[PDB]
Design a protein around this ligand. Structure first.
Ligand code: HEM
Length: 150
């Protein structure tokens, strides 16, 4: 349950972001690392003390930014009803727990998301657009938090 006018604020703004997902994704992660810098070591080359062993164990950053935005894409596609994605999102959450990402970190992503959108859109980031994106992202996180034994 999210109604057409709000779904449409989301579809439109996402269209602008979708012109350049890596560029905007990089803004999201930069804010993210400013807020939680301890997440950096989870990516290939994000360590101060790591060998080339991480390159295969760990995700590469720009590649993973693509994956993040693809998942957000699916959420947008299902903005009006998100239940067909809960299976997946519960599975994705489990993966993030498995490699040491705290649930609390996904809040920091939310802020970073709103920050990216705000930079991306300026006055077009209307209060209703911000609120709707909180609801949408919160719903995504809700589904994902299922993978944390909770
Ligand atoms: C602090 C935030 C985040 C960190 C540190 C992070 C870190 C990682 C890491 C380390 C992996 C590799 C997982 C593995 O192969 O075991 C990964 C995979 C992934 N992440 Fe994230 N992630 C974050 C947020 C997100 C968010 C918000 C999304 C989507 C909404 C996302 C989507 C993905 C996807 C799709 C994969 C691929 C997993 C697969 O192949 O099944 N991540 N993430």
């Amino acid at each position: 349950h999210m109604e057409r006018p709000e779904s449409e604020l989301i579809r439109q703004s996402w269209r602008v972001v979708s012109r350049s997902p890596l560029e905007h994704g990089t803004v999201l992660f930069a804010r993210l690392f400013a807020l939680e810098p301890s997440l950096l070591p989870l990516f290939q080359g994000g360590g101060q003390f790591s060998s080339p062993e991480d390159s295969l164990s760990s995700p590469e950053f720009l590649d993973h930014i693509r994956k993040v935005m693809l998942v957000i894409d699916a959420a947008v596609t299902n903005v009006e009803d998100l239940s067909s994605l809960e299976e997946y999102l519960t599975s994705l959450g489990r993966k993030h727990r498995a490699v040491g990402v705290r649930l609390s970190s996904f809040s920091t992503v939310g802020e970073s998301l709103l920050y990216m959108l705000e930079k991306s859109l300026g006055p077009d980031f209307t209060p209703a657009t911000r609120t709707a994106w909180s609801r949408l992202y919160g719903a995504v996180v809700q589904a994902m938090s299922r993978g944390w034994d909770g």
